[PDB]
Amino acid sequence: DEADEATQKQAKDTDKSKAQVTYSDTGINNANELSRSGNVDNEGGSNQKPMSTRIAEATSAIVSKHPAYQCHVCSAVLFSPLDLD
C-alpha cells in the first residue's frame, strides 16, 4: 500500500495521470518485503487488543475486596547608520 501511495504521488509531482517512475509493479518479485505496521507489539504479539488493555485485564483478576551606506568588510550595501553598526 505504501508503494502505491508513493508511485501515485510521484504522478502528482510530475503533473501526469500515470507515473513514469514507479515504486510498485516493478519487474522484481518483492513478495517477502515487510513494512513496519501498528499490528505488532514489541514482544512479537498481536495488537488486536492494546497493551494497556491487556495489562489492565491481567491485573483485574488479581484484585480482592473487603469482606461483608557601505561596508568595506564584505562589500554589502546598507541604508541606516544603525543598520551598519
Added chain:
Amino acid sequence: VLEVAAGRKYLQMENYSNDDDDPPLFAKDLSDYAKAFYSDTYEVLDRFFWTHDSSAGVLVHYDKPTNGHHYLLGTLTQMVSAPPYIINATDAMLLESCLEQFSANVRARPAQPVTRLDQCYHLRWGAQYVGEDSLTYRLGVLSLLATNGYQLARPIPRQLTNRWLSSFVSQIMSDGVNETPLWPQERYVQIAYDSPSVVDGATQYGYVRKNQLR
C-alpha cells in the same frame, strides 16, 4: 541423453519375395525398428528410463558399443518373412545377434581377431512384460549360452535363409526344459567360472563371473 534413430540395415531389392531361400532381414529393413539412446555413462541411461516407456524391451551391447555407450529400445514393427511366426523387432534383434555369436564361437581361432568378443544383445530393462514362456525369454537363455561359449550341435549356414530361421525358431519353441544352469537376469551378464569367454577381462562394466557356477 541423445536419441538417435536406427537406420535400415538391409535394403530390400525388387526380387525379394519372402521365399524359403530368401535371406532373413530381421525387420532391420523397415522404417524405424529401434531407437538408440546415447550418453557417456550408464548410470545416466539407467536413470533416463525411470521416466520412459520400456515395455518393448531395451537391449545393450556391453562389449564394443557401436558408437559409444547406448541402449536400444525396440519399436513395434515386425518380421513376417519367416512363417509361421511373427517376430518383434526386439525379439528379432536378439535372434540375429544370438545366431551371429553361436556362429563365431565355432570359427573361433586363438590368433584370429573378431570385431566384438560378445555379439549378443542382452536385455537390460523391461523384463516384466515378458513371460517365462515367451520367445523373448528363451532368446535370453540362448543368448546367454552363446555368450558363455556353447555351440549349436546343428550346422549354421554361411548364408541364412527364412526356412532355416523358421526351423530354428520352431525348435526354440518346442516342448522341453532348460537343461543348462543359466537363467536370464537384467542385473548383468553371467559368465560361468569355467567358461572360455574372456569379455570380463576386456570390459570394465556389464559382466560378472560367478565362482560357484560351473
Added chain:
Amino acid sequence: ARAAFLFKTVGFGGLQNVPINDELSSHLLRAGNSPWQLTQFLDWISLGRGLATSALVPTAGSRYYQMSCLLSGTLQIPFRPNHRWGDIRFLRLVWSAPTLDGLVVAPPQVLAQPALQAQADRVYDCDDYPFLARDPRFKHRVYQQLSAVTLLNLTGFGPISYVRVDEDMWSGDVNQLLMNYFGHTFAEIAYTLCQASANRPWEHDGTYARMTQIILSLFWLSYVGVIHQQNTYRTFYFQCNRRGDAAEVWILSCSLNHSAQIRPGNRSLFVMPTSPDWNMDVNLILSSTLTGCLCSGSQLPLIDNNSVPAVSRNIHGWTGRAGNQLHGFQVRRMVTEFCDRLRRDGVMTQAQQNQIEALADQTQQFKRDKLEAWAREDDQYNQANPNSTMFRTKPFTNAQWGRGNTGATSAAIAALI
C-alpha cells in the same frame, strides 16, 4: 553414485527370536498397514516439540528400533533363496503382494502351519529379489529406509550420521533453495526433505542431495559450537535457545556479523551418539534418517571394519577394509564441549555455562532413570512370557553411559572447517 544395494537386519539381544511380538507389531500397523514406516514415524514423533511417549513405545528411539525389527523379520521371507513372498507368515503376518506394499493377517491355512524362524544379523542385496531389481525407482524409494535401518544396526550404539564440508557444493540453485528454510526448525526441514525425497529420489550430485548434506553440516557444526551467531558459515547457523533441555529445538537462522573463512577442499566423517539418551533426541535421530536418504543415490565413503562389530564387516556397500572411523560421543559431555567452545570465543559467560550445564545434568538424570526403568520392565516381561520375548527399546549397557571419545570427536568435527 551408489551401485550396491545391501542392508543389514538387526540382531537379537541374546534372545531366541527377533525382539518384537504381535502386540508390538499391531501397535505399529495400528493406523498404517505398511512396514515402511518413515511417514507414520514422522507423525507420532510430532516435530519433536515435546517428549513423545507411549505404553508400548516409550521413546522415539524405541519406535525407531521397533520399526527396524519388523522389517528385519518380515523381509527375511521374500529374501529366502527361492524368493517366495506369500507362502509363510511371521507372527501372523504375511505380505500383501510381491511388491512388499503391506502386511496383513495370515489366512487360516497359513496360521495353521509354523512361522518363519528368523535369524539375526543378516546382510542382503536388494538386487537379488526380482521385483526390487526390475523397478529401480521402487528400489531407490525403499532403500532410503533400509539404509536408515542399516545405519542403526551396524553397531550397538545410536544412529550414524554423515558430516561433510565442501565449498564446491554451494551452487546457484542450492543458495536459492536454502534461503527459504530461514526460520524453520531442524525437524520442520527434515520432515519436508524426507517427503520430497520419497516422491522423486535424489540424484548423485543433485540440488536436494547437496543442500541436505549442507544442512547436516550446518547442524553439527553448530551442535558442537564451532559456528554461531558471531561466526557463521556463509551467514548461516543453527540456533538453540535452550541447549541442554530434554527436548531441544534448533532453528536455522542468519547473521551478517561474521562469516568464518573456510579451507578449500572436501572433508567428511561419521558421527554417532554412544550414550543411551539418544532414544530421546529427535534431532540426533532425524540427522541419521537424512543421511539415510542420501544413500539411495550417493555412495558414501566406506566405514573402517575396525570400528564396527565383527558381524557387520566387509559389507560391500558399507563397511570396508581401510575406511573412515566412526566418531562416538556422550550427549551430556558434548553439551560442555559446546559451552567451553563458545565461552572461548567470548560469546557466553561463565554464569551462562553453569546455568546450562546444571540443566543438562538434570536432564540426563531423568532420561537415564527412565530408560533403565523401562529396560527392567522389559526383562520382567520376558521371564513371564517366554514365547513372545521382545524389547521396546534397543538394549544398552551400563558402560554406554561413560564419556569416551566424546572430546576426541568434538575436535574432529571442528576440524572440518
Added chain:
Amino acid sequence: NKKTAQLLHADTPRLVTWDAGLCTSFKIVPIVPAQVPQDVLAYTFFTSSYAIQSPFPEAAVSRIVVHTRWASNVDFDRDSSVIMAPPTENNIHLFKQLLNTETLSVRGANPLMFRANVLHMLLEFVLDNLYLNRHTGFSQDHTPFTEGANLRSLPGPDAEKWYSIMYPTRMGTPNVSKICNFVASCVRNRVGRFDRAQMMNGAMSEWVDVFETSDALTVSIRGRWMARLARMNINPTEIEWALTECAQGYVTVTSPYAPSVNRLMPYRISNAERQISQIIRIMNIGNNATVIQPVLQDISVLLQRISPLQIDPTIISNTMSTVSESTTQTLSPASSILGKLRPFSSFRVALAGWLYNGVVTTVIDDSSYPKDGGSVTSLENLWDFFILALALPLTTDPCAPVKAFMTLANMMVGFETIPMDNQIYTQSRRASAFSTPHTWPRCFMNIQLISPIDAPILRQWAEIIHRYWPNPSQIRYGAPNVFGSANLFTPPEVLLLPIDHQPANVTTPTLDFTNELTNWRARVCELMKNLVDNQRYQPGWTQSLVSSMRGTLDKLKLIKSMTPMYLQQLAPVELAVIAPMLPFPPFQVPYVRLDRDRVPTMVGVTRQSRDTITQPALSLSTTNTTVGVPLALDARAITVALLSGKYPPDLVTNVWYADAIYPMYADTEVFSNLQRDMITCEAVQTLVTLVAQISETQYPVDRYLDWIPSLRASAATAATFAEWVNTSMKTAFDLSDMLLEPLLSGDPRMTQLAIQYQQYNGRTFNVIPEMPGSVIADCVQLTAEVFNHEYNLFGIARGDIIIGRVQSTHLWSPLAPPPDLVFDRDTPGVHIFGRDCRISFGMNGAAPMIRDETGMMVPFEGNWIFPLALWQMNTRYFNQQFDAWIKTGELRIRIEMGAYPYMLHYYDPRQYANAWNLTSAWLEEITPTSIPSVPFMVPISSDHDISSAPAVQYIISTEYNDRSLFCTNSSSPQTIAGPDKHIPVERYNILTNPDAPPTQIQLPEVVDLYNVVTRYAYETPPITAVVMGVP
C-alpha cells in the same frame, strides 16, 4: 451428473484452522456448593469472602467433565463437539445416539450398542479438536504475584476471568485451604511465556512455547495434526520450479529471494496417496459414459483456446474448383466429394481421448459406414471409404486397423475375394463389428493368404495398413517433486501417444509433408488411383470420368493441410502442457500397434475381498469389477479436420504459446485438489481402523475397548456404522460431495484397493498401492487408549454392580465400596445362573426355588450372579419374583455388565436416606433392549464434625469408579466426614514435581491438566501471492 461434477471440481477440505483459546477438553465443575457460611469456621476465613478469583471451583464437591473446545475460540467451527453434563444429570443420550433406533424409552439405551457408540464418540472427540494453536500476544506482569512473567492474552471481552484459570501458580496463598495448599506447593517459575523464535525485528514471533492450562491428550492430538501438515509444506521456490517444469518453458514465474516469515502451505502428498484416490476416482465412473464425456469436452475446449491451429474448409473447396471435367458427364468426382464432406468438436475430442484410454475407448460411429456395406462401383462409396480410412487411425480403438481393412473388403465382395476365418465373421459382415482381437481374420495377419492375382487391390491395402499405420510414441510431462504421480500402469511423467511425435526444431513453421499422417493420406490416394486404373475396372467408366477422378485424387494428396504436421510437432506438446492442470489426471494403457498379443482386453478394480483371502494380490484376479466404455465420434468431421488445417500467417510458436498458456497457469485449482486426495485417503484408513473394532477384519490393529459390550455385528450393522464415520468426516471438513460412498457398497468389512489390466495373451498386471499412514486414525486409537484409563471422566463406569441392601451410618462412596461387600464367580457358596435356569413355585409354605447353572435349585437368598442379558430376557417375571426379597429380605445379586453409564444422587448425611425408590425404578425399567443409567446415592463430604444418621443403600460397584472426583471442600482446610480427596497432584506433574522436565506428559495413564503448549503464527497466503508470473 453428481459424479460428473465431482470429477471436474470436488469440494476442497478445510485443512487449516486456528484456535486462540485454551487447548483443553476437560473442565472442572461444582457439584455441591461450599458450606459457607457455617457455625464453626467464621466466614472471614474463606477466600471467597474477599472476592478472590480462584483457579478451581470453591465447593464441597467438584468433578471433571468432558467438553471439547469449552475454552476454545476459533475461526472455523468443525461442528463436531462432544459435550457432557455434570454426573448429577442424565447423560444417557450420548451413548444411544447410534443404533438405538429401536429403543423405545427415552431415559434408556441399548447396551449392545455401547461400544459402537463410544467408538464413534471418540472419533468426533478427535475431529472436533483438529486445529492449530494460534499465538496471540502478551503483557508483562505489573504485580508481584509472578516475577515479571509474560502473560498471554486471550481475545474477546470478559477476558479477565481466564487469567486465573489459565495460571494457578499465580494465585496468592493466605489460607490453609485445600486450594492454597496445592498452589503453594507448585514450582514458581513455570508460568507464562517459556521460549520464542523472534526472527524479524518488528514482526510477530514465528512461534512461542508457553505454560498454561490445557490437557496432555488434546495437546498431543493437535501436535500430530500439525506434524502431518508440516510434512505437506512446500516453499515458493519449490513451486516456482514445479510450475516452470510443467509449462515446458512457455510460461515463467518467480519466487522471491530473502528472509521470509515462515509460511504454512500444505500441498505435497505421497504418490501413494495420489494413486489411491485415482483409483477411487476411476471406480465411480467405469461403464457410465455420460460421466466421462463432459470431461473430454472440457479438455476439448481448453485445447481449442490454446492451439494455434484453425480449421478452414474453404481450402478443400478452392483446390476442388480447379478439377478438370466434362459437363456432359453423369458423375462429378469434384462435386460428390464436397457433398460427402459437408464442410471441430470430434477432432479436439479424439485428442483428449488419448489421455484416458484406460477407461474410455473412442470409436468411429456406426452411422459413418455405408448402410449396405458399399460397392466399389459407386463413386459415392469410394469417398465413403476414403473418409473412414483417413479417420480411423485417430481413434483409441485398438481394432481400428482391422476395421480400416474390412471397410474396403466389404465393398470388394464379388470383385476380389479373400479367405475369411469362418462362416459368421464373413467377408460381408459390417466392418464395424470386428471389435475384438479374437476376430482379427487370419488373412489380415498373414498377408500371404491374400492372392496377389485374384485380389490385388485388397492385398495392397493390407500391405499398407501394415507398413504405414502410425507408430505410437511418448512425451514426458508434469513435475512430481511437488505433485507426485497419478500414473498407474505407466512410469511417472510418461504420457503415451498413438502417434509418432518428432519435436519441431523451429519457431517459424512452413508447410511440411514429411509427416507420418501425410504419407497415410498419400498412400490411401495412390491405392484408390490404382483401383481405378485397374485393367478390369477402368473399362466401366467413361474415359473422361477417370481423368477427373485421377485429377481429384491428386489434388487431395497434394492438398496443403497443416493438421498432419501439427499432430506431429505441436499437438503432443499442448497435451503435455495441459496434463498437469487437469482435475482428473491421465489414465492410460499401452498403445500397441498390430501386436495383438498385447491388446488390452480388460481393466478392473477391487474394493473388497473374498472368503478367507487376506492378501490383495490373491483376491484381485477374482474380485475386480471391470471398467470402461466406448465413445463414438463422427468420421466425417475428423477427416475434414485432417484435410483443412491452417496456421495463422505470421506464426511464431515461441511467442504464441507464451500468450496462450499464461492464463491457464493462474488457476491454482490443481493445488487445491491435492489437499482433497490427502483427505480421501485419511478417510479410508480411518474407516478400516474403526470398523476393525466392532467386526473382524484382515488388518492388524490395536484393541482397547473390548471390555465395552457390543453385539454380534452383521454386514448390515457394519455398513450403517461406516455411514456415520463417513458423515462426521464430511461434516468436520466442510465437504458436501462424495467421500467413501464409492467404497460403501454393501459390506465394508474387507475393503482393499487395487487395480489390474490384462492383455490378449492373458498376461495380467497388478497394482497394489502402499497404504500411507493416517493421523486421524492414529489419534482416535490414541484417545481410545486413554479412554481405557480415564473412562470415568467420560461418564462411563467399568465392571459390574451388586444389587443388595446395605444399611449403616458409614460414609463410603458407593463408587468405591469396601472389599468384603463384593463377591465374584470364584467366591465360596455363590450361585451362578445360566440358560437352563427356570423357577419352580413354592407350595404349602415351602419356599420357591430357581435353578442353578449346574442344576441345583436354590431358594431366594444368598449371593447370586446374573449376566445382564439373563435379566433383560425376563424383566417382568424376575422383578415380580425377586424384588421383594432384595428389598426387605436377604438376597443379593451381582449383575454382570462390563461397562455402563452412571448417574449420581448426593444426599445430606445427617438425615435418613433410603435409595430403594431409585433402584426400584432402575430394575423395573430394564428391557430386552434398554437399561437406564445406573443410579448411585453418594454422601456429601463435610468440613466439620456433623451428627450421623442411617442410610439404606442397594447399589454399589465392583471396582473403583470415583476417578471423576476432583476435590472435596476445596475451599475449606480439611474434609472431616465423607469421602476426602485433595487436588490430584498427579495431574499437575510439571508443577508439583520440580525434578520433571517441562515437556513431560504421562499419557496414556494420566491426563495432565497443565502443560507446555506450542503456539504458532505462520502465515497462510494464497499461492498467487508469493509465486508471481511474468506476463
